[PDB]
Amino acid sequence: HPETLVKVKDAEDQLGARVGYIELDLNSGKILESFRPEERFPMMSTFKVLLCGAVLSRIDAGQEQLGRRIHYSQNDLVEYSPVTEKHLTDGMTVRELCSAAITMSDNTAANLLLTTIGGPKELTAFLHNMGDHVTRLDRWNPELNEAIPNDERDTTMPVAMATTLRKLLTGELLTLASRQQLIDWMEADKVAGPLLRSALPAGWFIADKSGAGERGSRGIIAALGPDGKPSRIVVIYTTGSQATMDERNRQIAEIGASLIKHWAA
């Protein structure tokens, strides 16, 4: 059972592509191990957690409401919108939009949420305010998944994403209610079965969010731990590979198996 860093490097070889990885202690925020922690990768759909962070922050400040109902139309629908495409008549609440965005990676829900905050620039501004000057969202769905080589648009670094995720989940940035909601959404993720969840023993907790983009881009952010409590943050990205979606999933699942098999170390 390879050690995690050995498996991550092996994943680069198998995939013919850069893989970035970091593991943080959730409590302390201490980096436990990392690989290409300070290189940039497309965030892809993992941005949606940060987006819902921004939305929750607005909620906490009285500028937004969980129950606010948004009506929208056919023209707003983009590909991979399994929830939003069913609510053209009745609309959806902000709460339901964040659920759909995080748990089903509903692309239209994420655009709708971007509108509520005034666009990708406002997410980037929210990030800057929290101290994250690396992570940047520049475009909307679907364009933000283009993953053009060395384009810094819509990118993060594993270390920036990991830290920012920790601040959202455990910091004072969001109220206790909002922090809990955010983690509850990520716990309820439905579309990341083939990734770290496929390696997870019964009884563990995981709150995650996946992403896939062009040019083989794939990744996942997670808070996970044994005994029903998250204790570490794991962030994994890759971009460039020509491997199949299944192949890229497998490598990420295998990185997950390693970190699980060595967790007690």
The experimental method is X-ray
Is position 73 annotated as part of the catalytic site?
Answer: no
206 and 229 Cβ atoms separated by less than 8 Å: no
173 and 58 Cβ atoms separated by less than 8 Å: no
Is position 143 annotated as part of the catalytic site?
Answer: yes
Bind-site residues for substrate: 209-211
* CA nearest to 79, candidates 47, 109, 120: 109
239 and 147 Cβ atoms separated by less than 8 Å: yes
41 and 18 Cβ atoms separated by less than 8 Å: yes
SS (H, E, C) the chain: CCCHHHHHHHHHHHHCCEEEEEEEECCCCCEEEEECCCCCEECHHHHHHHHHHHHHHHHHCCCCCCCCEECCCHHHCCCCCCCHHHCCCCCEEHHHHHHHHHHCCCHHHHHHHHHHHCCHHHHHHHHHHCCCCCCCCCCCCCHHHCCCCCCCCCEECHHHHHHHHHHHHHCCCCCHHHHHHHHHHHHCCCCCCCCHHHHCCCCCEEEEEEEECCCCCEEEEEEEECCCCCCEEEEEEEECCCCCHHHHHHHHHHHHHHHHHCCCC
Residue with token string 């475009």: 139
Tell me the Ramachandran region of residue 6: left when phi exceeds 0, alpha when psi lies from -120 to 50, beta otherwise: alpha
Distance CA 236, CA 111 (A): 24
Residue with token string 């670094």: 157
* CA nearest to 233, candidates 23, 53, 20, 8: 23
Which architecture characterizes domain 1-265 according to CATH?
3-Layer(aba) Sandwich (3.40)
Of the candidates 12, 34, 45, 254, the residue annotated as catalytic is: 45
What are the boundaries of each domain within the chain? 1-265
Distance CA 234, CA 172 (A): 21
Bind-site residues: 209-211
